Design a protein around this ligand. Structure first.
Ligand SMILES: [Mg+2]
Ligand SMILES: [Mg+2]
Ligand SMILES: [Mg+2]
Ligand SMILES: [Mg+2]
Ligand SMILES: [Mg+2]
Ligand SMILES: [Mg+2]
Ligand SMILES: [Mg+2]
Ligand SMILES: [Mg+2]
Ligand SMILES: [Mg+2]
Ligand SMILES: [Mg+2]
Ligand SMILES: [Mg+2]
Ligand SMILES: [Mg+2]
Ligand SMILES: [Mg+2]
Ligand SMILES: [Mg+2]
Ligand SMILES: [Mg+2]
Ligand SMILES: [Mg+2]
Ligand SMILES: [Mg+2]
Ligand SMILES: [Mg+2]
Ligand SMILES: [Mg+2]
Ligand SMILES: [Mg+2]
Ligand SMILES: [Mg+2]
Ligand SMILES: [Mg+2]
Ligand SMILES: [Mg+2]
Ligand SMILES: [Mg+2]
Ligand SMILES: [Mg+2]
Ligand SMILES: [Mg+2]
Ligand SMILES: [Mg+2]
Ligand SMILES: [Mg+2]
Ligand SMILES: [Mg+2]
Ligand SMILES: [Mg+2]
Lengths: 33, 180, 141, 56, 25
RNA sequence: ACCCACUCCCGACCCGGGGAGGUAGUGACGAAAAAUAACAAUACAGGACUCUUUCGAGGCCCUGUAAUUGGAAUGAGUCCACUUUAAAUCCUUUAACGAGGAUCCAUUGGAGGGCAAGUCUGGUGCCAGCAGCCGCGGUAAUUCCAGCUCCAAUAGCGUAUAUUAAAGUUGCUGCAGUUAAAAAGCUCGUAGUUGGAUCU
RNA sequence: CGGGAAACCAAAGUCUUUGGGUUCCGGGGGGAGUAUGGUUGCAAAGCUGAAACUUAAAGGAAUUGACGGAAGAGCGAUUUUUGUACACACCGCCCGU
């Protein structure tokens, strides 16, 4: 099941309250760390 | 005035960055592979290696014929070869810079008890050492961080008083035998 | 440009000594007016007697009522507003009580919404506020 | 302003008792568990790295 | 406030003080 | 609090004296070493290995997880004795007792970013509160009050304050001065600083 | 040519490949070129010149918009003229009683 998409979350919440979180998730999606 | 001495020093240095992912992973790998109690035991060996490297680097800026360089680099190389981190063919002053922390970690009594087959685990080796089952050539040593010299390598055994080394059985065996 | 002569040591040293006074922190540390104006007199902590309880309005864009106490120090008699940090700890302090006060963390500068407050309460009636908050010790009474 | 509302929320939260859990290991044993959990035991992944405390 | 007029106001206030804060007093 | 047993000093002295000094007591200022578990069988799960093309197959090996089982090892303690010492204490050495929830229970701070780690659930609703800074909280709070879980160091961990590095933000190494802070309105001039080639 | 945040500068070049000589002078924004002391002047004022306290930004150059009682190349954002201290965008911002 595909529940959370880091790309969509970053592109949507990059300017909202939860930006600093979603960015941190997107990096975990990209660099594997 | 008193007849006491106040000479003492710390044996470790804490890292500048408290939360660095790569450093945490490396130190945890070292702890897991060598059965260490905490991070401070890694930092102690790192500090020792740093001091040795600093001495070697200070001796490499002198002229090759300088008497102090010849006297002190020879002693440093002799000590490194004695403890077993260095080899006889690599007794130049440049090879000291090629030493790693695992080389010093391999010379502890805890890892040598495990590598010699006296224990079936590194943690079992630590437990055996701390419980007074291991002797070094005449003496019962219960310090896991004991650094084994080369000439002592052949002389690690169970203690004569140990239940494993031919001694009297322990508390649990005696109580269970008394039960039946 | 700067002078690079071989006999200009006096000039360089004198110029540096005179230009160090234009550093805010150096002048603050070496002038003595700040030490004279500091209510603690250079100490980390102090003891005082609670004159009363006050409520300070939080600066915009925040809206709140921060609970503080007006106290008077024992060694010099100066009056000070200290912050009582926790949820409901102001009910642990009574009037005419003796409190231990420390700095707020920014070396005499105000912290956060609270305007003009640079001190916080540590112990009340010789017991720490943390122990009272966690229910480890009770008020002596 | 009014000081009558001090302690309002902390005295409103319903009380919940902590449950009973088995004691945690200490010292070398805790580090052994962390080492076996983070590096020795790893499941195949498809690149979506998850944190230790991820939920939904 | 324009800096020129601020300076002029400061000067007038200082002159008023000087008249009030007489050296004889 | 104990003693001149050690180190030394004084005296007419090999003999006397010494809160000088030594020995204990209090002591998380600080520094060193170092426990809080280890193993085996089962019950599950992964890897290599082979045979089987696939369904598959195995004590055939290696590694992980269990308030599932089992019997081994120990010192923390209680405590004879010796040793230690002026007499003791402590450490060391040794009899006997001493571990399964081995209840003989590890804490201090955090979980938006800086910075390692949950937009999980229940309350509250710009209130109470958090927050070094940016910020959170006005009915779906990743930040408050809690439960669970998860991070960091660990017999230690937070806080306030002085100070060092970070600061090439005091710049000798090594900073700037058109517009971001900045070159005197202009010239003369004493002290200071600096001073062209040439002698085997 | 090379510099620089850029606007631009043959100097504002020959600077982490950092040293030709020398003078003055700056150290986040306010309080403030204010108070006080000294000194000069008939006066107006000139020179020297703080602290307590307060604040998380103020400021430079350039870009895209919005307003106006105006006519391959750049570190990078980015790629009708023009000005801007506006960007919740003139229904703006903002000064003093
Ligand atoms: Mg708010
Ligand atoms: Mg004596
Ligand atoms: Mg005598
Ligand atoms: Mg005494
Ligand atoms: Mg004494
Ligand atoms: Mg210590
Ligand atoms: Mg314990
Ligand atoms: Mg906790
Ligand atoms: Mg929480
Ligand atoms: Mg953080
Ligand atoms: Mg993180
Ligand atoms: Mg703010
Ligand atoms: Mg809710
Ligand atoms: Mg919620
Ligand atoms: Mg410094
Ligand atoms: Mg430096
Ligand atoms: Mg500074
Ligand atoms: Mg340099
Ligand atoms: Mg500068
Ligand atoms: Mg200017
Ligand atoms: Mg000029
Ligand atoms: Mg001259
Ligand atoms: Mg010459
Ligand atoms: Mg330079
Ligand atoms: Mg300034
Ligand atoms: Mg200031
Ligand atoms: Mg292009
Ligand atoms: Mg390009
Ligand atoms: Mg114009
Ligand atoms: Mg524009």
């Amino acid at each position: 099941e595909l529940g959370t998409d880091p790309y969509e979350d970053f592109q949507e919440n990059w300017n909202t309250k939860h930006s600093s979180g979603v960015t941190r998730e997107l990096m975990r999606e990209l660099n594997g760390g | 005035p008193v007849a006491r001495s106040w000479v003492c020093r710390k044996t470790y240095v804490t890292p500048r960055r408290p939360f660095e992912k790569s450093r945490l992973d490396q130190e945890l790998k070292l702890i897991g592979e060598y059965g260490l109690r905490n991070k401070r035991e890694v930092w102690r060996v790192k500090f020792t290696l740093a001091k040795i490297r600093k001495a070697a680097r200070e001796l490499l800026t002198l002229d090759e014929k300088d008497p102090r360089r010849l006297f002190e680099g020879n002693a440093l190389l002799r000590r490194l070869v004695r403890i077993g981190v260095l080899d006889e063919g690599k007794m130049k002053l440049d090879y000291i810079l090629g030493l790693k922390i695992e080389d010093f970690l391999e010379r502890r009594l805890q890892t040598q008890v495990f590598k010699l087959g006296l224990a079936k685990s590194i943690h079992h080796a630590r437990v055996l050492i701390r419980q007074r089952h291991i002797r070094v050539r005449k003496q019962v040593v219960n310090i896991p961080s004991f650094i084994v010299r080369l000439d002592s390598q052949k002389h690690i055994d169970f203690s004569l008083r140990s239940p494993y080394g031919g001694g009297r059985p322990g508390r649990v065996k005696r109580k269970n035998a008394k039960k039946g | 440009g700067k002078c690079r002569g071989l006999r200009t040591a006096r000039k360089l040293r004198s110029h540096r000594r005179d230009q160090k006074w234009h550093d805010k922190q150096y002048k603050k540390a070496h002038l003595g007016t700040a030490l004279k104006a500091n209510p603690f007199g250079g100490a980390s902590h102090a003891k005082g007697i609670v004159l009363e309880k006050v409520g300070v309005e939080a600066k915009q864009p925040n809206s709140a009522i921060r609970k503080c106490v007006r106290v008077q120090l024992i060694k010099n008699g100066k009056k000070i507003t200290a912050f009582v940090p926790n949820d409901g700890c102001l009910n642990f302090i009574e009037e005419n009580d003796e409190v231990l006060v420390a700095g707020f963390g920014r070396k005499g500068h105000a912290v956060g919404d609270i305007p003009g407050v640079r001190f916080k309460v540590v112990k009340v009636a010789n017991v720490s506020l943390l122990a009272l908050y966690k229910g480890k010790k009770e008020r002596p009474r | 302003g009014s000081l009558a509302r001090a302690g309002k929320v902390r005295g409103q939260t319903p009380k919940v008792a902590k449950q009973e859990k088995k004691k945690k290991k200490t010292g070398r044993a805790k580090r052994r568990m962390q080492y076996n959990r983070r590096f020795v035991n790893v499941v195949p992944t498809f690149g979506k790295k998850k944190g230790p405390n991820a939920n939904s | 406030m324009r800096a020129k007029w601020r300076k002029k106001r400061m000067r007038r206030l200082k002159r008023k003080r000087r008249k009030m804060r007489q050296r004889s007093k």
